Amino acid sequence: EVRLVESGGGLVKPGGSLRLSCSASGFDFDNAWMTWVRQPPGKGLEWVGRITGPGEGWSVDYAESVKGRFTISRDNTKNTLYLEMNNVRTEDTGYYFCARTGKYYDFWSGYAPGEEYFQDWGQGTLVIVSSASTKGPSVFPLAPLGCLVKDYFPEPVTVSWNSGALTSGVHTFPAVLQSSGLYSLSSVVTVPSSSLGTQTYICNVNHKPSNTKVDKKVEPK
Amino acid sequence: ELTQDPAVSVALKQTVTITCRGDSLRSHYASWYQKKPGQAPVLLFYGKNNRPSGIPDRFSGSASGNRASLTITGAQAEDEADYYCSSRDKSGSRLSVFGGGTKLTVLSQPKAAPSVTLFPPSSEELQANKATLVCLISDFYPGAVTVAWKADSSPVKAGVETTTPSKQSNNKYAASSYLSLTPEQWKSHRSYSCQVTHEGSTVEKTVAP
């Protein structure tokens, strides 16, 4: 019944600007504390910032890594929370989550410092800060067998063998993201050793973002 | 500021404790979150003995000194995930921080050694003044491998890109490692080898011009 939905993510070049939004329903959003959290792919969660409610004057706190570049604001009339990202860097890449933030404190006893906990989350929106340009793969045969799909941006590519006839023993490995910012992947099929001469094995590579379609025949050296 | 062990493994239905340590924990409570790929984090526990409704009873937390601990009593396969502690970054501060995170592996399959296939540079690639060796690793469990590249039994410390393991359909894991080389280096050495170490056992494949 509590719903949070982030949007606005996408591809942005370093130094660009971006506005994320998080819409909310099912709870008293107007008075709720709201927190932004991000996660770089493969890395840990990082607290971005939080906007308070009326009791704290709608004040905002930021992580030092984003202070002076990010601004968090809210539009209570629209039940929408915003994260404005300016002068973004590659380190800002990641999934961005908005979280309804609870407060664990006892006003009347004062026995402990108040704790903020994140009880409801949206599904997240992906932001990629990359200077990489659209790039078609170089397709190289891997002789006895498979295909090497090298140096492409962005994801995805599609690989099929013998125009979809060969689906048995085909293992298309997940792509690797290199330090260059470009992807590479390999697709390999296990075939009978005797059938090498009899059957011609061709792999079909499609990279729609670059309008690249390559059919590479794989055969022994 | 908040430090946890990066990796721990538990057997099915066994007990595992994931611990968070930091100076702030001497005076502040910690909250605990479960994070799986492609899914939002989930609050598991916070404060002094608070578990949100809908969180199974096998999750419980504790705290003493400068540490906070999340205990899973009877881990299930669905409990395999990253777990993060969260607290104030320091006393007198309005900022929160997450711990480094702990990847909990729940051993849900028999141990399986990886199958390794190593491919030499293509003739077409070499004619383009480029050379890459492809080391394909599949059918291993659990999903953690260390890949080492050797140039005639000498370790190569450049031009290596390796994927994190990803689950296959048969619940084993696959990974790949790529070594980038100029054509000169590929012919300057007699052989090149991919060394895959899994659960203390090393699997080596070798190619040559």
Residue numbers in the entry:
A (entry chain H): 1 to 52, 52A, 52B, 52C, 53 to 82, 82A, 82B, 82C, ...
B (entry chain L): 3 to 9, 11 to 95, 95A, 95B, 95C, 96 to 209
Wording from the paper:
Antibody 10E8 is one of the broadest monoclonal antibodies thus far identified that effectively neutralizes diverse strains of HIV-1. It targets the membrane-proximal external region (MPER) of the HIV-1 viral spike with a highly hydrophobic antigen-binding region. Here we show cis-trans conformational isomerization of the Tyr-Pro-Pro (YPP) motif in the heavy chain 3rd complementarity-determining region (CDR H3) of antibody 10E8 to be the mechanistic basis of its multipeak behavior. Overall, our results show how a conformationally dynamic cis-proline and the interaction between the CDR H3 and the CDR L1 of 10E8 appear to provide exactly the requisite degree of structural plasticity needed for a highly hydrophobic surface to recognize an MPER epitope.
We tested the influence of the di-proline motif in the CDR H3 of 10E8v4 on its SEC and HIC profiles by mutating prolines at positions 100f or 100g to alanine. Compared to the SEC of 10E8v4, mutating either of these prolines resulted in the three-peak profile of 10E8 merging into a predominantly single peak, suggesting that the prolines cause the SEC anomaly. To define the structural basis for the anomalous SEC and HIC behavior, we determined the crystal structures of 10E8v4 with Pro100f to Ala (10E8v4-100fA) in two different space groups, Pro100g to Ala (10E8v4-100gA) and Pro100f and Pro100g to Ala (10E8v4-100fgAA) variant at 3.7 Å, 2.4 Å, 2 Å and 2.7 Å resolutions, respectively. After rigid body refinement, the CDR H3s (95TGKYYDFWFGYPPGEE YFQD102) of the variants were defined clearly in their Fo-Fc maps contoured at 3σ. Extensive hydrogen bonding networks were observed between the CDR H3 and the CDR L1 of 10E8v4, involving heavy chain residues, Tyr98, Ser100c, Pro100g, Gly100h and Glu100i, and light chain residues Ser30, Tyr32, Lys51 and Arg91. However, these hydrogen bonds were not retained in the Pro to Ala variants, suggesting the YPP motif to be critical for coordinating these hydrogen bonds, and disruption of these hydrogen-bonding interactions correlated with the degree that the CDR H3 conformations differed from that of wild type, their reduced binding affinities, and their reduced neutralization potencies. Crystal structures of P100fA, P100gA, P100fgAA and H31LCF variants all showed “open” CDR H3 conformations, which correlated with reduced affinity to gp41, reduced neutralizing potency against select viruses, and reduced affinity to the column matrix. Part of the data presented here favors the Masiero et al. proposal, as we found the P100gA mutation to reduce affinity to gp41 and neutralization potency substantially and the P100fA variant to retain reasonable neutralization potency against viruses tested. Guttman et al., however, observe from NMR characterization coupled to pepsin-LC/MS assessments that YcisPtransP and YtransPtransP are predominant conformers in solution, and therefore conclude that P100f is the key residue that governs 10E8-anomalous SEC behavior.
